[PDB]
Amino acid sequence: EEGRLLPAFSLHEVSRVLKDFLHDACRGFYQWLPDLSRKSEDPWRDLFLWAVLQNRYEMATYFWAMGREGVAAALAACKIIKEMSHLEKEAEVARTMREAKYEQLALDLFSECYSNSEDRAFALLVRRNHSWSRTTCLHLATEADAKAFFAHDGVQAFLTKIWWGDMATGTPILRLLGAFTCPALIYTNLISFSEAAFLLTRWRKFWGAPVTVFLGNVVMYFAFLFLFSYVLLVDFRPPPQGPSGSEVTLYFWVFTLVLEEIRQGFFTDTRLVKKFTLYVEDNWNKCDMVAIFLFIVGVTCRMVPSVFEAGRTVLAIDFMVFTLRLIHIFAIHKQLGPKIIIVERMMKDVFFFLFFLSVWLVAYGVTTQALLHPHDGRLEWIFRRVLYRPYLQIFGQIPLDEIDEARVLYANWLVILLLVTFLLVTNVLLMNLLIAMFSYTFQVVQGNADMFWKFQRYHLIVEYHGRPALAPPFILLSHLSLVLKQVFRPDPVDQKIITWETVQKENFLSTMEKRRRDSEEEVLRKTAHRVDLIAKYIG
Amino acid sequence: LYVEDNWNKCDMVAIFLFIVGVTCRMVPSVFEAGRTVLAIDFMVFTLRLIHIFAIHKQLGPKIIIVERMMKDVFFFLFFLSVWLVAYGVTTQALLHPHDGRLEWIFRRVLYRPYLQIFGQIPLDEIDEARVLYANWLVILLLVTFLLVTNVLLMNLLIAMFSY
Amino acid sequence: RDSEEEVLRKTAHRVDLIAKYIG
Amino acid sequence: YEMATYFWAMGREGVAAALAACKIIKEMSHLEKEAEVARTMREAKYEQLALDLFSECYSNSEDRAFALLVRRNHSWSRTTCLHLATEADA
Ligand SMILES: [Ca+2]
Ligand SMILES: [Ca+2]
Structure with a gap:
């Protein structure tokens, strides 16, 4: 009905709703109507789609059992079902729809393929899938948000192997740090290296790895952070030219940084609105953007010498933001990652707890004010006292100074009782409500934690893999080279892989069936039927 | 095999410290620093006294547990100290314009985050500074600290502890 | 030997043999 | 595995061999x-058989079990059981 502006709808509307479900995956299905008498190009896939659309599970499973390119279809089906x-x-239908469980079959099959000839499993995982409009498996895995699929051991092994590039090895951390510190030690056999121009190629294969680029970027980030702290500490001078030197240096640094950010966010694209949405999707990019906004406000400060102080405070806030951004590295470490994710997860309820605690704080303060003394000549001093008292509760200083002076004694005991009630009920709740959800996310959502950590691992890895192969200063030269290049401008092993995949799938299915056959309950059922038949035939 | 044991390793480092103390006793001009070295060596010898706690059935497993959970706490302290420093540097700009002597600033900026655990909260300079826009930011940051550290230091700890 | 699963397996084989021999 | 277990069932100086095998497997x-082969290799589980047998000997005549535990083992080049237990980190 919307497009037009024995049922009427034809295969055109089916292709349209499919593209609506998956844009880049299956845009070209059923290329307006063709000749109905023509045979199908891939029958099993079409029947699979028709089955899964009508929410007919067993039919879909069967149709999948007779088709090629297994895991890709299994992930796409999970996407469409979700x-x-x-x-x-x-x-009622929504519950059973949400009870699809295709990703379980996908992961099971992929484990079966991974069990043997993993060297081919890795090829499959990045292989182009022919039926689904030339789309890689990981693209579907991402579009389906199949966190469970990423958590697979083979997926993590592939991620690790890509994390070290061609120079992959065991590579102890200290040995790597030393080899990076010693530019000549790399030519020695300090670590294993997989297979004038020779040394150029060797150094290229060295710096091309992701781990080394990550280490270099974190070093440069830490160094620039320290240097900016220095420039903000002592170089915050009047607007003569000399003071502006370090300032314009930091300005150029921030310019290169925001250029690299906008490149990683906008050229990593169907539509400009698509690039904007995907850039706004990440929260790390969001704090990056707010930090650049704060730096712009600081530049506006540097423009005007009359409001230099407030703008110095703005620069301080921007530095606080840049320092908060430094926690980005904690996710990669196996010991620090899950802890950081846990701390991130438990950040919601603590805010409302602080809100309730602050509300209670204020009521106590206002009450104490009436009982403290009659009126007040200056609001300020009262502001300082009434602010410091509940703020010092956590401190434990308990500066009942004014109260002691006030007694010189009926308002003291009420204050003591209220402070005791606070130091008990807050002390209780702040860990009682916390530990429950903490152990929850740690054990019952241990799977959620590990899965989210592995997902963030994959994201960071794929982000740093495409990172520019140059220094952030030289990144300008890389972009210029790209713009200049823009202005100037197999099958048999694939069939072997496909046959191997189908064979492994058939073997897995047969094994599952045979294992189900000899179960105890099936044995009792069969023996019951048999003894009943024997008793009937005998009499 | 001698280097395999860690107890022998601290034994050897303690003998090294005692050798440095002997070298001190050789020279009367550097007697003070070497007295500090002897103090450190005594601290090491005293730390070695925990060796007996392993034999007792009640103290042994507890000592082993404390030994096991000694890795993550180091990185936690590292992260906490990093956060401490950022807050201190920020507060410095908002505190006041420049500083005539680095020393006093060193004492203040060291004592403040060190006193957070203490709870003394010597916002002395801040009170003087107001004589008032930098105070509330400091209060908010100290609250955020005393909540998130208080939370994590037992949340991440109890999981691996019960584990 | 005398586990429950082994008992069920043996009894199943036995009743199957009996059913085949009888008919 | 199964071949090794059978061969062990027909031999003398049991626990020493059972610990040495765990050492070599690890x-x-x-x-x-x-x-793929590494996983099943790490799934050896010989120390379980060693401990089970030693418990069986300890059940009766522990006065002789203690002698066995420090006895010299003839086949394995005159080596005590505890030495193998240590070298295997069992
Ligand atoms: Ca970014
Ligand atoms: Ca010793």
Whole structure:
């Protein structure tokens, strides 16, 4: 009905709703109508789609059992099933729709392929899939948000192997740090290296790894952070030219940084609105953008010498933001990652707890004010006292100074009782409500924690892999080279892989069936039927 | 095999410290620093006294547990100290314009985060400074600290502890 | 030997043999 | 595995051999070229059989069990049981 502006709809509308579900995955399905008498190009896939759309599980499983390119289809089906759960009109059907469980079959099959010939499993995982409009498996895995699939051991092994590039090895951390510190030690055999121009290629293969680029970027970031702290500490001078030197240096640094950020956010694209949405998707980019906004406000400060102080405070806030951004490295470490994710998860309820505690604080302060003394000549001093008292509760200083003076004694005991009630109920709740959800996310959501950590690992890895192969200063030269290049401008092993995949799938299915066959309950059922038949035939 | 044991390793480092103390006793001009070295060596010898706690059935497993959970606490302290420093540097700009002597600033900026655990909260300079826009930011940052550190230092700890 | 699963397996084999021999 | 278990069932000086086998199995896990074989290699579980047998001997005549535990083992080049237990980090 919307497009037009024995049922009427044809295969055109089916292709349209499919593209609506998956844009880059299956945009070209059923290329307006062709000749109906023509045979199908890939029958099993079409039947699989028709089955899974009508929410007919067993039919879909069977159709999948007779088709090629298994894991890709299994992930796409999970995507479509999870999609057709919010658009459901009946909650009864919505529950069973949300009970699809295709990702389980996908992971099971992929484990079966990974068990043997993992060297081919890795090729499959990045192989182009022919039926689904030339789309890689990881793209579908991402579009389906299949966190469970990433958590697979083979996926993590592939991530690790890509994390070290061609120079992969065991590579102890200290040995790597030393080899990076000693530019000549790399030519020696300090670590294993996989297979005038020779030394150039060797150094290229060295710096091309992701780990070394990550270390270099974190070193440069830490160094620039320290240097900016220095320039803000002592070089915050009047607007003569000399003081502005370090300032314009930091300005150029921030310019290169924001250029690299906008490149990583906008050229990593169908539409400009698509690039904007995907850039706004990440929260790290969000704090990056707010930090650049704060730095712009600081530049506006540097423009005007009359409001230099408030703008110095703005620069201080921007530095606080840049320092908060330094926690980005804690996710990569196996010991620090999950802890950081846990701390991130438990950040919601603590805010409301602080809100309630502050509300209670204020009521106590206002009450104490009436009982403290009659009126006040200056609001300021009262502001200082009434602010410091509840703020010092955590401190434990308990400066009942004014109260002692006031007694010189009926308002003291009420204050003591209220402070005791606070130091008990807050002390209790702040860990009681905390430990429950903490152990929850740690054990019952241990899977959630590990999965989120592995997901962030994959994201960081794929982000740093495409990182520019140059210094952030030289990144300008890289962009210029790209713009200049823009202005100036197999099959048989694939069939072997496909046959191997189908064979492994058939073997896995047969093994699952045979294992189900000899279960105890099936044995009792069969023996019961048999003894009943024997008893009937005998009499 | 001798280097395999860690107890022998601290034994050897203690003998090294005692050798440095002997070298001190050789020279009367550097007697003070060497007295500090002897103090450190005595601290090491005293730390070695925990060796007996392993034999007792009640103290042994507890000592082993304390030994096991000694890795993550170091990185936690590292992160906490990093956060401490950023807050201190920020507060410095908002505190006041420049500084005539680095020393006093060193004492203040060291004592403040060190006193957070203490709870003394010597916002003395801040009170003087107001004589008032930098105070509330300091209070908010100290509250954020005394909540998030208080939370994590037992949240991340109890999981691995019960583990 | 005398585990429950082994008992069920043996009894199943036995009843199957009996059913085959009888008919 | 099964061949090794059977061969062990027909031999003397049990627990010493059972610990030495665990040592060798744990050793031949880092020197493996294929992770698939490495997993099942690391799934050896000989120390379980060693401990089970030693418990069986300890159940009766512990006065002799203690002698066995420090006895010299003839086949393994005159080596005590505890030495193998240590070298295997059992
Ligand atoms: Ca960014
Ligand atoms: Ca010693």
